[PDB]
Every structure is written in structure tokens, then in C-alpha cells.
Structure 1
Amino acid sequence: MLTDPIADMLTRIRNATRVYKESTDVPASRFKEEILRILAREGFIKGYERVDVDGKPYLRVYLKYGPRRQGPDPRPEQVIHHIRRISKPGRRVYVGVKEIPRVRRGLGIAILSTSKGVLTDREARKLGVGGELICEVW
């Protein structure tokens, strides 16, 4: 039945990055888009694009990574080190603009839904709106 399509997507990306895939797909959905769109615009992913598995709308999400490392375990540093859903289905989180979180002292982002649209933490303050704190990413 799949509980939270969002947490899923976020997770799909986390599970994929760790193994360094080039792109994991995800079941398509308008609201899901924005998350990517922003997530990409800020520089967390090379990009995304609609696709189709055996007659099912999905989304390719081309992952970004750091350069190779020297020494034991040439594991390439991540571009997404951290990603986590805040407002869950079993606990909706809502914040006023006068109280929106600063992810990793500004290094990080905090995407969130709002009456004006899905916006970054900063863009939230920009247009001065609060909303459902979706998740943060750094």
C-alpha cells in the first residue's frame, strides 16, 4: 500500500547514493516533482526526467557525487550527505515563517510546502510564508 510516497522517494535517493548508482527511478507524482525540481536546482542532483516502466509513470533522478578520493577506500565523497523527512503522515509538522529552521547553519536546505508553493527555507522567508516542513537536506 506504500505509506508515505515522499519519504519513499527521499529514501530511494539515499539508498541509491550510498551504492553510487547513476540514477534511480521513482513513481511519478506532481507534488513529488517539486521536491526534485528544487532538490536539483539547489545542486543536489544532476537532474531528473519523466520515464516509463512497462506502462508506469516514473522519474529518473540523475545523482551527483564528489571527485575520487586518494588513499584507502577511494570512496567518492557524497553530494547529498544527509536527507530526512520531517513532517510524516503520522505527525504533520507546520511552521510559521517567524520560526523556520536553518539547516546546518545555512549550508543546508529545508524544503517545505506552502500556500505559495514548494520553496527552500530561504525562499520561504523570501516571500514570508510558513507551511508544512517537508524535510531537510545537506
Structure 2
Amino acid sequence: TLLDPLANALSHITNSERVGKREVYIKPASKLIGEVLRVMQKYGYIGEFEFIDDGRAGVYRVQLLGRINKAGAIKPRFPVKVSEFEKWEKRFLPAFEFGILIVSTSQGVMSHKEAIEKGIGGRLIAYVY
């Protein structure tokens, strides 16, 4: 059965990008998915997205700009300190500050660069590049 809607959404995004789809629909909708999409839009990896009510968890409509090489959830959600980010960057990214490691912190979910700037850690919930 369904286990991780966030992982489902990221895998679907990657699959549809590889064939060049312009639009995708994410179902079911969750606030974690919404925040991750917000971060991706802020960093310019996706286009406009919107939330649609359907009498259920909801749906997300997302526009793809053909910029994502690969996006995927990180599991298990490893906890990470401020000084323990280089190893994860080397593991999940091709080059320094190339992609974004989406991290859930005590002050909301944000990019690992933002987490470093704010001097806080959290858990690694996804990665995109």
C-alpha cells in the first residue's frame, strides 16, 4: 500500500521529466509536499504549482521547466547536525552547492544551504538537482 506520498511525488516528477512532460499531478496532497514544492520553486527547479480540492487529501498541479536532472526522497530520514553536511552533499550531489538537500528543521523545511546559514540542523527528507 501507499507508504510515502512525498517519495511517490518525487519519483513521479523525475519519471515525467525524463520524458519531458510539461505538467504533472501529485496525489495525494500533503503540507510536507507543498513545502517541498515551495522550496523547489524558490530555487527555480519547477514552475507554477497550485492546490486543488477533490473531497480527499487533495491534488497538486505542477508545471515543469525542464530543469530537474533528478529528484528523490531520502530515507531513512537521517538526522544531521550543522557540521555534518559535507558527507551528505558528497553522497547525494555531483558537485559542491550543485543541488539542494531538502531538510526538515525545527523552524520549518528549508534548503541545506539555508540551514547552514541559520546555523541549525534537522533531518534530511529529500534531495533535488
TM-score by length of 2: 0.86
Instruction: Give % identity.
Output: 39
> How far apart, in 1, do the equivalents of 2:77 and 2:106 lie?
16
> How far apart, in 2, do the equivalents of 1:50 and 1:22 lie?
17
Q: Output the aligned Cα RMSD.
A: 1.4
**Runs of 5+ consecutive residues of structure 2 not aligned to the other structure:** none
> How far apart, in 2, do the equivalents of 1:38 and 1:134 lie?
12
Match of 2:104 in 1: 113
RCO higher in structure (CA 8 A, sep ≥6): 2
Q: Deviations over 1:83-127 (max 9, x none)?
A: 2222x2xx3311011112333211211111000110101101111
Greater than 2 Å deviation, 4+ residue runs: 101-104
Whichever structure has more strand as a proportion of its residues is 2
Match of 2:84 in 1: 99
| Structural mapping, 1:1-138, within 5 Å | 1-26=1-26, 27-52=28-53, 55-56=55-56, 57-65=58-66, 79-86=67-74, 88=75, 91-100=76-85, 101-102=88-89, 103=93, 104-138=95-129
TM-score by length of 1: 0.81
**Runs of 5+ consecutive residues of structure 1 not aligned to the other structure:** 66-78
Q: Which amino acid aligns with 1:46?
A: G
Q: Which amino acid aligns with 2:6?
A: I
Q: Which amino acid aligns with 1:96?
A: K
Structure with max Cα Rg: 1
> How far apart, in 2, do the equivalents of 1:97 and 1:129 lie?
6
C-alpha deviation, 1:23, in angstroms: 1.2
